[PDB]
């Protein structure tokens, strides 16, 4: 009838695994009901229309002269901005334009209470936010993309390569980095990578597009593990599979090949494709968009992994997080396609520095800070729910008792 010191440990395991399963189910429960809305949110926002702002000042202005003030949901807003003020637009392919606009709009709409910009002395003071191969020493103050014409064939500097980066920090994420590069021969790339902070146990997000004369030659998207076992959490795998069923249906499964450098980082559900026609490209685009949005909405509810003194389990977990992040970091710079693209034009002495400080830098002792601006949520709130100052109440009771005379 009584129990033994071994089944009570069985009981604690029962309870804790049940709780883990419960939270993992709660994560996916929201996506499960309608997955098509992970891509179709913009069209719905457009359908519902403009909203009429009703603050006391807005109503007063509207009743004095004539003016109606309108607002829009953040999805419609990030579709009017587009590839807004990138300096290298107008030479970027329309597919890369679509993808960059969507990704950065997601970052701006979902993480808008902690999204800082990465510390400027790391990347933006050296001048790595806009890089030209005809002006590596930056003596044209960063207008080389306009002052210098394109070299002709066989001339010194052919083929010309130019890069544009953007880097952000946040609460959960220690680096959200997007980068677009163009070469003169007709090659365009796009490289996105989202890194969580060392104290969190989440997988890294990554996306690459590489297209040649308007034809996508390589498109890879991966929510890549961080553990030594290379298996994600139940919600990550469940979401990737549900999304592949929703968007990649009717598509060649034998196309998601594993490259020689892939299985060392690839989650079993990672995608690597060389699209054939418009259908493959449209399906892949919708799928990558929905996957990125899901990854962010899942991070929205994350809790740090804290190692209390006396608990070694969490210390080992944090060590594992460090190993996985660094493994991915030095395993990505051996994607020597883009690295040789860079080193054939910019040299090697500049490339080592730029790559080791920005591209896939790893510094467990260094994660930047962030700026918590959630109090603004209060101000905006109290602009649609104002309270007036103890004298308007007498007057309003007067008005109510007066009009109700009828």
């Amino acid at each position: 009838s009584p129990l033994s010191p071994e089944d009570i440990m069985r009981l604690v395991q029962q309870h804790e695994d049940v709780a883990a399963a419960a939270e993992s189910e709660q994560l996916v429960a929201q996506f499960r009901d309608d997955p098509q809305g992970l891509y179709e949110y913009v069209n719905r926002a457009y359908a519902e229309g403009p909203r009429r702002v009703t603050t006391p000042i807005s109503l007063l202005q509207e009743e004095i002269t004539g003016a109606v003030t309108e607002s829009y949901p953040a999805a419609v807003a990030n579709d009017i901005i587009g590839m807004g003020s990138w300096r290298l637009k107008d030479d970027v392919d329309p597919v890369i334009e679509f993808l960059v606009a969507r990704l950065e709009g997601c970052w701006r709409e979902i993480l808008d209470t902690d999204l800082c910009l990465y510390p400027r002395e790391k990347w933006k003071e050296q001048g790595w936010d806009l890089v030209d191969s005809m002006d590596p020493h930056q003596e044209l103050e960063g207008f080389s993309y306009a002052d210098i014409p394109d070299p002709a064939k066989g001339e010194a500097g052919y083929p010309r390569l130019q890069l544009e980066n953007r880097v952000y920090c946040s609460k959960v994420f220690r680096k959200l980095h997007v980068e677009v590069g163009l070469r003169q021969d007709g090659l365009q790339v796009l490289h996105v990578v989202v890194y969580p902070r060392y104290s969190y146990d989440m997988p890294i997000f990554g996306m690459d597009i590489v297209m040649v004369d308007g034809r996508v030659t390589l498109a890879v998207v991966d929510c890549c593990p961080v553990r030594a076992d290379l298996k994600l959490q139940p919600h990550y795998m469940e979401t990737m599979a549900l999304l592949q069923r929703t968007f990649l249906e009717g598509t060649d499964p034998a196309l998601r090949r594993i490259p020689e450098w892939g299985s060392k980082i690839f989650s079993p559900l990672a995608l690597c494709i060389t699209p054939s026609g418009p259908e493959e490209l449209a399906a892949f685009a919708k799928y990558a968009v929905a996957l990125h949005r899901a990854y962010l909405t899942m991070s929205l509810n994350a809790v740090p992994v804290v190692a209390g003194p006396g608990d070694r389990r969490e210390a080992a977990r944090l060590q594992e997080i460090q190993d996985g992040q660094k493994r991915f970091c030095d395993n990505q710079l051996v994607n020597k396609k883009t690295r040789r693209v860079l080193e054939v034009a910019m040299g090697v002495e500049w490339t080592e520095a730029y790559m080791s400080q920005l591209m896939f830098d790893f510094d467990p002792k260094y994660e930047p800070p962030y700026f918590d601006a959630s109090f603004e949520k209060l101000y905006t709130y109290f602009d649609e729910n104002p309270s007036f100052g103890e004298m308007a109440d007498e007057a309003m009771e007067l008005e109510r008792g007066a009009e109700a005379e009828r």
Binding site: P94, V95, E97, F98, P278, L281, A282, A283, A285, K286
Partner: peptide
């Protein structure tokens, strides 16, 4: 009045 963009719905 034209799009000139690219969307996966043609």
């Amino acid at each position: 009045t034209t799009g000139f963009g690219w969307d996966p719905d043609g």
